[PDB]
Each structure stands twice: as C-alpha cells, then as structure tokens.
Design a protein around this ligand. Structure first.
Ligand SMILES: Nc1ncnc2c1ncn2[C@@H]1O[C@H](COP(=O)(O)OP(=O)(O)OP(=O)(O)O)[C@@H](O)[C@H]1O
Ligand SMILES: [Ca+2]
Ligand SMILES: [Ca+2]
Ligand SMILES: [Ca+2]
Ligand SMILES: [Ca+2]
Lengths: 349, 346
C-alpha cells in the first residue's frame, strides 16, 4: 500500500506519507501527564497548567520509551489517523544512535503497532539525499543537538562524526535571558521562540555589527503581539545565534560549529576532503537563521587550506530535509526490497 | 541489499547504460536516444570498462537537469549508491549538473549532448505542513439525546434555540441560541473541544458565546445577522429523531463468508458493539457521512469489504453525490463519529 515517514526529533515531530513534498503533521515531541492520563504534542502544551510535561527524545536520542509509545500512537492514530498495521513505516535515527536503541524502536513498531514493515534511516544521510548528493558533510542543528556528519558515497563515516549539545532550545533560552536583562519579563517562551525565528540573524562580522548597533538604530526590529505589546530588539538579534559560533556565550566550553565542521573534515581521509569542503549541506531548523551560510563560508574558508574550493548549500526547505529524504527513499521502487518485514522479524539506504 | 530487475542488467559487459528516473523508478533510456537528456529530469549513467586484468571498472554518474524536481534528483542520488552497492561498492560516483558536466562524462558521447525541454512530471504530491482548509457549520440540537448534524453555511440554518459550531479550521466559533437549552449547550461544547483537540490535534481555538455576542469572524463569513425563527419545535420530537439518525453495521468473514449485518437501529450505540476482530460501518449518510471503522485485528478481506459495502450505500440510497466515506482506525475516532455512543471512553 502506502508508506509512512516519521522523523522524530527532540523538539518536533514531522510525520506524513512517503510521496509527499513535505510532512503532513508537525508537532511538539512532548507527553503530558496529570499531577485521560496522557496528552501529546500541541494538546499537551495547551493543557500544561494541569500537566507535567516530559520530552521522550533527549539530544536526538530516545530516552523515555513509555512516553515515546505515546508519541507514536499520537502520530498514527491522530496526526495521520491511519491503521499502522496497513502501512510500512520509515523512522529516522540520529548519527551514532546505539544499536540497542534502534532495536527497541523496531520491536515497538512490530510488537505494539503491528506494522507490516519498517526501516530505520539516519537523518543526516537523508538530508544529503534530499540535496541530491551522495557525498558531502551535513550540519544538522535542531532543537536539541547538532551534528557534523561527513558522508562518502552514501555512507556516514562514523569516526568523523561530531555531536554538540547546543541547538535551538538553548538559543531560545538565551534569547529569554537577554530580553529579560534588557527589561522585558519573558506562556511567554513561545513568544520568545517566535521572535527568535522572525528577527534573529547571523552576522557576517560579529564585533563589526556590535558597533553598528551602538552607532544608530538601523539594526532595531520589533515584534508586535496581538495584546498590543511591541517588543523591540537590537543587537540581541544577532547575538543569540552568534552562540553557535561562540558557545561561550551560554557558558559552554565546547567549540563553535565552524570549528566542528572543520575538525570533522580533518578526521576524514585527505583524498575526500575536496568533496567534503564543496558540499556542506545544512540541515535543520536551527540552521535557518538568515546569513548563516555566508558566515559558514567566511569562517571555514579561513580555517581551510588557502586554495580550497568551498561551498555551503542551504536548501530553502532545510527545516524538513530529513523528512523529505525519507519520503523519497520510502517511495523508490528499490525500497520494497530493503524494508524489514514483520515475517522477517518473527524469524530472528 | 538490492537486485531490482534493471540492476540485474547493470554492468555485465563493457558498455554505456543510462536510466532515467520516472516517478520514483529507474527506467532504461532507449539506446537510440543516448545523448538526449530532458532538462526537467535526472538520469543515472553507468559506464563499464574492460580492465586489462579481467575484472570490470565502474563509473556511476548521476546527471541532474536544471529544471528537475527534488524527488527526481534525490532518487537519482539514492539509486546511484544502490547501483554502486550492487556492484559491491567498486564504482566511483559523480554528480553531474547540467552545463557543468565533467570532461569524462561528455567524453562518453561522440556527437555532443542535446538538451530537450520538458520531462516526466514529479512524483511528489504537494502538501503544506499542518494546513487545514475547512469551512462548515454544525446544527446541534436535542435534550435527552443531543446530536450534531451538518447544514449549509448561512443564517438560513440558524434558530433561536439550537446551538451551532461555525468550524473554520484554525478557529472554531461556538454559538448558542437565546431560547436554547442546557443540554444542547454542554454537548455543543464537547463537540467543539473535540474538533479542536482530536480532529485538529490541538491546533485550533474554540470560542463560546451566545445570541448577541457574535464575534468579528462569524459575520465576515455569514454577512449581517437577519431576524430569527424559533425552530420547528420541542425537544421530545428532536430526541426521537436523533435516536434514529444512523445505523451501525458489522462486517465479518469470521465464520467463512462475508456477512454485513445491521447491529443497531437506535441510538446511543454501545461502544462495546465495536469489536477489534471485525469492521463496522456507521451510516449517517443523509447528512453526508458514512464511517468505516476498522478493528485493529480485522483482516484485509473485511477491511476491503466494509469499504466497498459503504461506498455501495452512496449509489444505492440516493445520498448526495458529494457524500464521502470516512475511514477510521480503531483508536482514531472523530467527534462526529463518537457522538453516537453513550459516554465514550478511550
Ligand atoms: N526560522 C528559524 N530560525 C531560527 N530557528 C528556527 C527557525 N525555524 C525553526 N527554528 C528552530 O528549529 C528548531 C526545530 O528544528 P528541528 O525540527 O530540526 O529540531 P528537532 O529535529 O525536532 O530536534 P533535534 O534535531 O535537535 O533532535 C527549534 O529550536 C526552532 O525554534
Ligand atoms: Ca532532527
Ligand atoms: Ca521532471
Ligand atoms: Ca564505492
Ligand atoms: Ca474477523
């Protein structure tokens, strides 16, 4: 029949049907219980006043298995509203997800949703495929984690992967801290997350832009709430995402994403870096800031050999690129061959 | 990992092969057209060379026309690595973009490339995530038994003592008559919160008011409010009608042959009636709705049968042509289906 693609992230869950452009359902990966004895996603968020919210997925890895059933249930029976038993199901996993992890995933899909078949795909490789490349290095950055994944001829080189626990929620938290320091008092995280995604931007030269912000108000942009409130925001516009380059803004001694990309290419065989450097595919919501690719350009060309050809690819729909990768993969004539069927499960890209 | 029919053909003797991607499939280009590439498509090309030792040398090139859709160029890419995998990985891979092909790739063609306008259309169905496009009105009436039925979106369906959900997708507007009743009120609320939490997965907002508090958007849709009829009559005869609004059928091949049977003539259907072993049809077709309910353990015959049976009901009972059948997995029931059961429990 028809395959489902479900890309479950730390902050959001993108779900829909293989063959589509894009995910049909996008919703918060949260599971709310009382202080109906469960609630999921957007409904859980609305009723958070009488619920305790947990996030099953931590930094790209599933960590609460009971709650994660609730998410998948909520996906099949409500977001998509379909018999899972009639539909093979593609799921995505993070770069260096433990074998034992993906085994639970797989058991749950068969033993509790009784899917007829399934496959688990690494997310970064899907984003690359969505870009129409077999070889590149991906920077996925979401709500909870950031990876650098060099990929050569369709396969991730696991020893060169880099994980970095700094992503969107952290940027949102930071924006809250500094909007507060500024004089606003930020039920109101959602307002702040909206501002982050409509007003923030990466600056080409940070100190250079700090100086522009001090000298006029040419850089000030406002956000208009429906209650009348206008929150106006200047240099914190570009300071917030500047954290990806300078983790020290939020107290983290980790290095920025332009260094982790460089260090990743350097863990790879010298004979494939030319290709890596010319194929920086950016995946993920946290990579959506205006100006980010020009910064990555600038920053990694200053790290890379003097004569290297460097390209950053920033797909306009990179917010859903993992998902789009899954839809294409799940739709291919060749994919019937490489599912894992329920029958194969009862005998044990 | 993959031995697709055309893979079996791939790379056996020294030559040039060219497939084009077509609606998620790999399809051989006719050899007589090798050199033509539609600019709206993506191709995979395998070049095999007799290496002097005995084994063969493999170069996969995937060419992407300037005007090809994302599914096509992704597929070209995915096929390329599967092609390469089928050859035990012993092929190097080459992204080729229109108008910047490698000297190597152009060399495969003696007479020059010839680009051709057009291509096979994308295999992608277009969606916009989370988007609902809904405009509809529900009359809610009753007392001992209150049900919600669909009516035309106008003031011509309003009355002083029924409730109404003007469902506009992202926003649900609930409306209550001045001369309405308490039980109509409660049930209208259950349904509105249902449409929001269940049908819309939490991504809508209900608003409750009465005759005279008419919000901004209620009027943008319906125009100005005219004067108001006091309904047909009374709740007792409205309950005797709500009670006979639908019929619930079972569909089961459980003893051998398929058997569509009437379970229930009258209302509150018992939830227990719906059993996981079989399928059910709740026919409410005079409104414009027939539900097929699918037990988690129903077999594919019963599922197929229930769906056909129900679509049969449309051409048979002179229902609106634009009546459609809505199919629900056990576990994924909608408010308008759920209303017909006594105190529904999940
Ligand atoms: N316009 C944008 N600008 C900045 N951030 C954005 C933008 N759009 C979305 N985001 C951020 O993207 C993040 C969600 O993206 P994504 O769906 O990739 O995360 P996730 O996959 O669910 O979590 P993770 O990948 O880390 O496990 C959120 O933090 C969100 O605020
Ligand atoms: Ca992700
Ligand atoms: Ca095409
Ligand atoms: Ca290879
Ligand atoms: Ca049966």
């Amino acid at each position: 029949t028809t395959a489902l693609v479900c890309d479950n992230g730390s902050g959001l869950v993108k779900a829909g049907f293989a063959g589509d452009d894009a995910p049909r359902a996008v919703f918060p990966s949260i599971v709310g219980r009382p202080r109906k004895d469960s609630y999921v996603g957007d409904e859980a968020q609305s009723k958070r006043g009488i619920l305790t919210l947990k996030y099953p997925i931590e930094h790209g890895i599933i960590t609460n298995w009971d709650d994660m059933e609730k998410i998948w249930h909520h996906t099949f029976y409500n977001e998509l509203r379909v018999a899972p038993e009639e539909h093979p199901t593609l799921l995505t996993e993070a770069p260096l997800n433990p074998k034992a992890n993906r085994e639970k995933m797989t058991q749950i899909m068969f033993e509790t949703f009784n899917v007829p078949a399934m496959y688990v795909a690494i997310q970064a490789v899907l984003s690359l495929y969505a870009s129409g490349r077999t070889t590149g290095i991906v920077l996925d950055s979401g709500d909870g984690v950031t990876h650098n994944v060099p990929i050569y001829e369709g396969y991730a080189l696991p020893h060169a992967i880099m994980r970095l626990d700094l992503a969107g929620r952290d940027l949102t938290d930071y924006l809250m801290k500094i909007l507060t320091e500024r004089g606003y008092s930020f039920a109101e995280r959602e307002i702040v997350r909206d501002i982050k995604e409509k007003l923030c931007y990466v600056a080409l030269d940070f100190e250079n832009e700090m100086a522009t912000a001090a000298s006029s108000s040419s850089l000030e942009k406002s956000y208009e709430l429906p209650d009348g409130q206008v929150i106006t925001i200047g240099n914190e516009r570009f300071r917030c995402p500047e954290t990806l380059f300078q983790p020290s803004f939020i107290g983290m001694e980790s290095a920025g994403i332009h260094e982790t990309t460089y260090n990743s290419i350097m863990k790879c065989d010298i004979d494939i870096r030319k290709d890596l450097y010319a194929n920086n595919v950016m995946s993920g919501g946290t990579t959506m800031y205006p100006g980010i690719a020009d910064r990555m350009q600038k920053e990694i060309t200053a790290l890379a050999p003097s004569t290297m050809k460097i390209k950053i690819i920033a797909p306009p729909e990179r917010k859903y690129s993992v998902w789009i990768g899954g839809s294409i993969l799940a739709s291919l004539s060749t994919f019937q061959q490489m599912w894992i069927t329920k029958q194969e499960y009862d005998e044990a890209f | 990992v993959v031995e697709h029919p055309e893979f079996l053909k791939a790379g056996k003797e020294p030559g040039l092969q060219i497939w084009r991607v077509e609606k998620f499939d790999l399809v051989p280009v006719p050899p007589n057209l090798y050199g033509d590439f539609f600019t709206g498509d993506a191709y995979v090309i395998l070049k095999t060379v007799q290496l002097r030792n005995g084994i063969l040398q493999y170069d996969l090139h995937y060419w992407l026309g300037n005007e090809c859709s994302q599914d096509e160029s992704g597929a070209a890419a995915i096929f390329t690595v599967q092609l390469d995998d089928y050859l035990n990985g012993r092929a190097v891979q080459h992204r080729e973009v229109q108008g910047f092909e490698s000297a190597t790739f152009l060399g495969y063609f003696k007479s020059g490339l010839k680009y051709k306008k057009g291509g096979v259309a994308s295999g992608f169905k277009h969606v916009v995530p989370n988007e609902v496009v809904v405009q509809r009105l529900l009359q809610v009436k009753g007392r001992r038994v209150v049900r919600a039925t669909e009516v035309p979106v106008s003031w011509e369906s309003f009355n002083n003592g029924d409730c109404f959900i003007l469902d506009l997708g992202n926003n649900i507007y609930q409306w209550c008559g001045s001369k309405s009743n308490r039980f109509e009120r409660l049930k209208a609320t259950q349904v509105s919160k249902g449409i929001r939490d269940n049908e819309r997965s939490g991504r809508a907002q209900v608003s409750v008011f009465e005759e005279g508090a008419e919000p901004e958007a209620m009027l943008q849709v319906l125009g100005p409010k005219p004067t108001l009829p006091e309904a047909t009559e009374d709740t007792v005869k409205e309950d005797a009608a709500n009670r006979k609004l639908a019929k619930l059928y079972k569909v089961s091949n459980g003893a051998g042959p398929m058997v569509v049977s009437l379970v229930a003539d009258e209302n509150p259907f018992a939830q227990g009636a719906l059993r996981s072993e079989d399928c059910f049809i709740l026919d409410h077709g005079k409104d414009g709705k027939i539900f097929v309910w699918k037990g988690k353990q129903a077999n594919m015959e019963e599922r197929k049968a229930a769906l056909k049976t129900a679509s049969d009901f449309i051409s048979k009972m002179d229902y609106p042509k634009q009546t459609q059948v809505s199919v629900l997995p056990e576990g994924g029931e909608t408010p308008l289906f759920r209303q017909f059961f006594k105190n529904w429990r999940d």
